[PDB]
Amino acid sequence: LHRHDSYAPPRPGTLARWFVNGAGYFAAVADAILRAQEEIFITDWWLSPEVYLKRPAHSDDWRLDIMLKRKAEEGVRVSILLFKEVELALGINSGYSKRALMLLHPNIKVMRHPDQVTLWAHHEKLLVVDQVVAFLGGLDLAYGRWDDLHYRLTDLGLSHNQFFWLGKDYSNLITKDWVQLDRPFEDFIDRETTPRMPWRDVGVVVHGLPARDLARHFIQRWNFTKTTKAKYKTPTYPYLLPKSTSLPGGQCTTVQVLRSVDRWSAGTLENSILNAYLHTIRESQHFLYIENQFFISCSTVLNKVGDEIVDRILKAHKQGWCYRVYVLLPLLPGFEGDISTGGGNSIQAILHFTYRTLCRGEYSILHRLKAAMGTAWRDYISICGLRTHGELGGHPVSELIYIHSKVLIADDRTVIIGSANINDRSLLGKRDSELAVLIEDTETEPSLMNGAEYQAGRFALSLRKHCFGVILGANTRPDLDLRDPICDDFFQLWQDMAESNANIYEQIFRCLPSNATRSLRTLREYVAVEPLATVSPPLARSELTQVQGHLVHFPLKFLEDEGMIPLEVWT
Ligand SMILES: C[C@@H]1CN(C(=O)[C@H](C)N2CCC(n3c(=O)[nH]c4ccccc43)CC2)C[C@@H](C)N1
Numbered sequence: 001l002h003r004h005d006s007y008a009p010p011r012p013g014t015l016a017r018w019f020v021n022g023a024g025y026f027a028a029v030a031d032a033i034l035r036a037q038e039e040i041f042i043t044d045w046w047l048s049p050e051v052y053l054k055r056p057a058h059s060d061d062w063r064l065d066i067m068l069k070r071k072a073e074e075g076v077r078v079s080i081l082l083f084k085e086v087e088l089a090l091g092i093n094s095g096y097s098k099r100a101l102m103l104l105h106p107n108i109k110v111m112r113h114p115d116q117v118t119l120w121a122h123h124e125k126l127l128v129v130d131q132v133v134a135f136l137g138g139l140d141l142a143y144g145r146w147d148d149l150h151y152r153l154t155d156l157g158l159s160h161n162q163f164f165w166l167g168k169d170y171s172n173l174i175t176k177d178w179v180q181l182d183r184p185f186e187d188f189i190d191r192e193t194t195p196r197m198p199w200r201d202v203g204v205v206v207h208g209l210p211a212r213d214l215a216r217h218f219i220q221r222w223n224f225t226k227t228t229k230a231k232y233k234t235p236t237y238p239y240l241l242p243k244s245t246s247l248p249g250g251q252c253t254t255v256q257v258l259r260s261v262d263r264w265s266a267g268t269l270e271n272s273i274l275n276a277y278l279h280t281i282r283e284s285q286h287f288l289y290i291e292n293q294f295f296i297s298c299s300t301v302l303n304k305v306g307d308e309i310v311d312r313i314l315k316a317h318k319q320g321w322c323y324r325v326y327v328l329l330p331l332l333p334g335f336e337g338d339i340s341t342g343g344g345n346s347i348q349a350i351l352h353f354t355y356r357t358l359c360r361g362e363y364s365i366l367h368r369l370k371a372a373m374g375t376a377w378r379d380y381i382s383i384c385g386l387r388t389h390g391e392l393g394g395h396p397v398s399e400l401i402y403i404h405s406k407v408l409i410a411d412d413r414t415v416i417i418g419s420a421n422i423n424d425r426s427l428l429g430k431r432d433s434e435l436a437v438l439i440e441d442t443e444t445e446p447s448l449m450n451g452a453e454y455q456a457g458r459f460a461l462s463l464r465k466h467c468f469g470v471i472l473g474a475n476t477r478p479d480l481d482l483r484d485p486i487c488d489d490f491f492q493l494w495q496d497m498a499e500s501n502a503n504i505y506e507q508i509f510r511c512l513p514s515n516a517t518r519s520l521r522t523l524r525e526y527v528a529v530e531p532l533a534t535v536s537p538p539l540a541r542s543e544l545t546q547v548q549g550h551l552v553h554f555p556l557k558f559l560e561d562e563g564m565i566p567l568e569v570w571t
Pocket of ligand 1: 046090123173178334335336421
């Protein structure tokens with residue numbers, strides 16, 4: 001075994017390029033698919049064959065199914081493995097994806113897993129071209145993932161099509177889930193009334209040996225699944241073998257591939273992602289920027305990411321060194337449900353576990369930090385989320401930006417980008433197959449750290465500055481300095497912006513979740529009041545001009561005054 005008990009060693013001299021939001025990721029994926037020569041391997045939790053990779057759409061030349069069919073007509077063998085949902089309630093419809101991809105061309109061989117009944121899934125997102133170029137991250141080739149820095153809530157207006165999201169691509173996930181995926185070009189929600197839900201995710205492309213290692217992981221999964229069924233054992237799904245016979249503009253770093261696999265998903269057991277996360281947190285010296293879909297830690301819960309975060313914060317406090325922890329989580333889990341009624345079942349469980357990790361209970365980060373340092377915890381940790389506003393139907397509307405990213409940034413020199421959420425199913429390895437990459441910088445660039453000269457890594461500094469600029473209003477506030485991420489002035493500005501934006505959004509939209517609804521009865525009486533956005537739209541619009549960025553403080557006090565199914569499915 002290699003470092004972090006990983007099947008792959010660190011790969012110095014690796015060309016890697018990061019992507020924020022789905023637009024650039026899909027553009028690079030399409031361009032790489034166009035340049036493919038022999039093989040394309042695809043790993044997805046949900047694949048939409050009819051998704052458009054480049055927008056606005058004026059032709060079918062950039063559709064995933066069309067591009068795969070055209071490349072297969074050139075002699076390229078397209079091996080795809082997909083995840084099969086336990087119940088059809090999960091609207092991925094793996095059967096339709098399999099059937100369409102197979103009907104495209106004989107060279108497109110698609111297999112699905114698991115076949116037996118289990119609580120666990122395949123959450124990995126991977127696309128390998130010629131075993132030389134590997135795209136990974138949290139971005140599936142699925143509906144609603146495509147987005148940009150604008151995070152548009154409206155799409156109202158094929159060679160003259162102005163729609164960025166066509167049919168099933170335009171969706172508000174919490175309002176209504178996908179239905180009837182077999183009809184792609186047909187809207188299931190009204191664009192004129194229901195705003196879209198912005199999507200935020202981070203991916204990365206790696207060139208060279210790490211791509212070969214990701215191809216090796218795909219090959220191991222393919223051969224394991226081949227020797228796991230009857231119809232898949234035929235030569236109609238030939239064996240795949242690796243090769244080590246050894247490009248968009250990126251950066252030269254050192255990239256190590258990490259994964260979470262078990263005997264049910266792959267042939268071996270590995271949990272290198274958890275080890276990498278714990279080592280990066282423990283060895284972090286200045287700051288930790290965490291952007292993850294789920295934050296379930298602080299051992300019902302077994303992973304110890306939160307424990308290491310607490311230990312590092314306490315050690316920084318005792319040693320008296322400057323240290324900031326930025327945590328960004330989506331405001332509500334990615335499920336359909338009415339938050340006015342208090343949410344659904346999965347949403348309630350995920351919120352309960354997240355609040356247990358963060359503030360509720362005695363194992364929570366906030367409780368231990370409080371018992372150690374009083375109210376000083378606000379100077380070391382900052383939990384926030386994203387929300388945006390726009391105009392629709394003559395009135396201001398607002399919606400959270402769903403944080404599907406899985407990224408950790410340490411000291412502007414180390415970056416973990418993957419598909420593994422911070423939860424037991426993705427980090428323990430025993431449950432779900434996940435992929436990630438640890439990227440360390442060998443080339444530095446001048447910057448500031450607590451007011452001192454700091455040789456920050458180019459890749460990590462670029463990623464962190466882009467994240468801060470998008471989260472804040474850098475394009476509208478050119479005076480803000482994003483070079484120093486740990487200093488007192490910048491942290492104070494960050495917290496002030498978060499609190500101000502949360503207050504403004506609550507005042508204007510009366511949105512949920514919020515700290516003004518601490519009980520279910522207060523929540524029920526709170527939704528009876530019509531928000532000012534629909535009362536005096538000019539006044540709310542004038543007030544909203546004070547909103548800077550999309551950052552809003554996380555509602556740690558939402559619903560705070562409140563056995564044949566295991567509790568580990570929502571952890
Ligand atoms: C499928 C469609 C579209 N949906 C999504 O894409 C949303 C955003 N999900 C949220 C849950 C996420 N997830 C995870 O992290 N581990 C998982 C293990 C098993 C299943 C999901 C898992 C994946 C993305 C919402 C859904 C209700 N209907």
